[PDB]
């Protein structure tokens, strides 16, 4: 988020590439998500990469 | 209650179906809570204890 207060830290800005109305075209979009649904990507090393 | 004003956005994924998610919590971020009167709760725990 900002980090700081634990109640704010949790608001993870989460950017990703999603399929557009045309299947060939792809758009980079972000969705605000918080805590548990966002899981550190398996086999990464404390990186910015996460999984659902 | 949940105090923070939260905006909403949607994303079209492929044809038809849209996906919904929070755009950004638009206010300040305060805690989420449940108020309960103490009086009535301490009256309850003892009344249950009696029975």
């Amino acid at each position, epitope marked *: 988020a*900002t980090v*700081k*207060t634990g*109640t*704010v830290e949790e608001m993870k800005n989460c950017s990703f590439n999603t399929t557009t109305e045309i299947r060939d075209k792809e758009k980079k979009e972000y969705a605000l998500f918080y805590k548990p649904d966002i899981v550190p990507l398996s086999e990464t090393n404390n990186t910015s990469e996460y999984r659902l | 209650t949940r*105090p*923070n*004003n939260n905006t909403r956005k949607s994303v079209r994924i492929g044809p038809g179906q849209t996906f919904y998610a929070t755009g950004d919590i*638009i*206010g*300040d*971020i*305060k*805690q989420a*809570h449940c108020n309960i009167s103490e009086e009535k709760w301490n009256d309850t725990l003892q009344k249950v204890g009696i029975e």
Partner: antibody
Amino acid sequence: QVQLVQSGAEVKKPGASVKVSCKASGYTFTDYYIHWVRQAPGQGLEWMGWINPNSGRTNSAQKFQDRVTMTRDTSITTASMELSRLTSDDTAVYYCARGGWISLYYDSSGYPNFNYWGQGSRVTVS
Amino acid sequence: QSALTQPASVSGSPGQSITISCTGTSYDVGTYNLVSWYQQHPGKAPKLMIYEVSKRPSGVSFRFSGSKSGNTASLTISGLQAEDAADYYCCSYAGSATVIFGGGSKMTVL
């Protein structure tokens, strides 16, 4: 009693930036929001938003849109504004003022309750 | 999204009750009781005169009152004094964690 102490006067060239700041004293600043206003010498006041001293989070007023950014340093009870690309239109007295109480469970950032004000500071753009 | 509209100036006799009005929109007020009033002697930072539409702050005497109605609100000053020659301003919650500052009105005295 509650003090809000500002810097002295300053003058800048167009396109320049200025830091405007204030020190809180006589109470604990961590418990309140700090808001900022401007008053041009012939006008009413313009409002700039609140900085939560603890979080360092803020909301910017309409017609600024990051033209001005705000920061804080809790170790010295000091609030600051960083005002960029100054135009002659920006000449005004800048004031530091204390807003409502802050608490973790309910939002109280919009409250127009400015009980304590600083001395004001002159910002001239020449 | 404009400033609260206020009379440029108002006036009256010593002892006279003066009411100062401020106008906005239903989004600005109907939704909120987040209304306050300030006054300032020229050359000085403003004093808060009213909290929560009509509540006197400590330090504000029982001369000052107020109310809200529809898209407007007002301050009532009983007992007009020469000393009231100060600017008066409204301000209120704009919504979306931002604050409206009013245009202001000047007190002049007779």
